Write a protein that binds this ligand. Structure first.
Ligand code: CL
Ligand code: ZN
Length: 467
């Protein structure tokens, strides 16, 4: 038993959302291979990432730390962001030093947190799509899929830990570029998805300043700011298409996995580095805001020793950015360094009592490319989500039980003043225990990016990257 170790296959998809994954109960037909894995295992309803942005999320994830601690807080490359020091234990270092073969395929964008994995760079394999634009994101996934299939088809050593980091549905970014501004959409042959119930922003004066002006600071939002309903539904359709594309590749990867006896000895994890607005709150992609579509990601486990659960686990707050490292170490029988703040979910996965749990979980924003630096923090408690931004001391407060779509900010309502204070207190506790420098940080927000009536439809001009 204890010397017979499982393998691991970690499949991560950039921008993948709970909404689009059928296992979560909202959208049918886009992720059947992922849903089949979920059906054999356990999915988590509350799985919040440490930052809704790729490089900060990935640097944090593979090191099991938070972004203010890695100090990789934006997507900028060296020297604005500096690679994780070589003395910080990572997933790869812990697994490699315990005798695992550790391999990584696909997207990196890790700022050194992948140290210990042997990385193979994918090669772009272009192809033509008859209905949606496809770019090097989609072409790279073809290479990644080929590499992962080749590896899992003939695994040279057990035990192994393999990461397959897919780009899609990130090609949604390219879609927005091809459809920027006022435009008529190219016809498509599918049924057209409906807008979500939280599409509209009811009151722009009741949201924080940085969220009001995402249209100025986020290039993709500048592009989509004046989109009509048709435009946004075609956006959702494209997102579903790119998700279907990556799910076919997941299928190929799983077929390769289960083509040898290594497969049945493998624990499969499916997650995303962050989500996508999917037109909720008029939002496209990810930038500044902390709404569930972007921060609450699919987080799915199945494999030997993991007990099947039909219902999603919703009595726990999880933080994949912190919890993946100790969970995988616990499943592999590898000791976790004491400084890591994550909590192993292996008890829940085994069907045992989860004695330790997070009383709340957190997300961070700092900047994307240092055009605008507008730090903020999210605290998800058991029932409410609280957000705070330094710029204007803006706050949000959402009842996630009665208002899961986050349509009614409760922060200015005196009836909720005690709940608001209570979540402010969770942020104070986080700052103390994590040594967050949040309270000391400076806002850098040019007033030319805050210079029209609040809200994306009223956006005028070319946005921050242009001025
Ligand atoms: Cl920026
Ligand atoms: Zn604007």
């Amino acid at each position: 038993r204890q010397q017979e170790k499982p393998n691991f296959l970690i499949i991560q998809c950039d921008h993948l959302t709970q909404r689009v994954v059928g296992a979560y109960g909202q959208t049918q037909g886009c992720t059947l291979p992922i849903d089949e894995v979920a059906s054999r295992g356990v999915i988590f309803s509350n799985a919040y990432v440490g930052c809704p942005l790729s490089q900060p999320s990935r640097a944090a994830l593979w090191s099991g730390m938070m972004p203010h601690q890695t100090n990789v807080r934006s997507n900028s490359s060296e020297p604005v962001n500096t690679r994780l020091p070589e003395n910080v234990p990572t997933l790869g270092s812990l697994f490699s030093e315990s005798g695992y073969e550790a391999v990584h395929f696909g997207k990196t964008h890790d700022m050194g947190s992948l140290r210990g994995f042997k990385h193979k760079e994918p090669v772009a394999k272009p192809f033509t799509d008859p209905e949606f634009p496809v770019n090097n994101d989609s072409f790279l996934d073809v290479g990644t899929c080929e590499d992962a299939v080749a590896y899992l088809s003939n695994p040279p050593k057990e035990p192994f830990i393999c990461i397959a980091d897919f780009q899609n549905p990130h090609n949604i970014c390219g879609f927005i570029g091809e459809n920027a501004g006022v435009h008529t959409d190219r016809p498509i042959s599918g049924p057209l998805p409906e807008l979500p119930d939280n599409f509209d922003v009811e009151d722009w004066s009741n949201i924080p300043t940085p969220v009001q002006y995402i249209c100025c600071s986020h290039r993709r939002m500048t592009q989509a700011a004046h989109w009509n309903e048709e435009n946004y539904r075609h956006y959702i359709a494209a997102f579903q298409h790119y998700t279907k594309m990556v799910s076919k590749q997941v299928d190929s990867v799983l077929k390769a996995l289960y083509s040898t006896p290594a497969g049945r000895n493998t624990i499969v994890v499916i997650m995303a580095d962050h989500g996508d607005g999917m037109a909720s709150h008029r939002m496209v992609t990810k930038h500044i805001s902390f709404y569930d579509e972007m921060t609450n990601v699919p987080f799915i486990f199945a494999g030997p020793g993991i007990k099947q659960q039909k219902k999603p686990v919703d009595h726990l707050l999880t933080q994949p950015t912190l919890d993946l490292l100790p969970t995988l170490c616990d499943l592999a029988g590898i000791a976790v360094p004491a400084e890591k703040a994550g909590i192993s979910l292996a008890p829940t996965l085994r069907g045992e009592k989860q004695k330790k749990s997070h009383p709340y979980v957190v997300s961070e924003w700092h900047s994307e490319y240092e055009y605008v630096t507008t730090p903020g923090r999210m605290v998800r408690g058991p029932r409410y989500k609280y957000t705070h931004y330094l710029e204007g001391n803006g706050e949000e407060l959402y009842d996630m039980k009665k208002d899961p779509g986050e349509r009614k900010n409760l922060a200015k309502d005196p009836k909720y003043s005690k709940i608001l204070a209570e979540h402010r207190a969770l942020l104070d506790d986080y700052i103390t225990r994590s040594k967050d420098d949040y309270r000391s940080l400076k806002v850098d927000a040019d007033p030319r990016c805050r210079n029209h009536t609040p809200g994306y439809p009223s956006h005028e001009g070319p946005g921050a990257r242009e001025i």
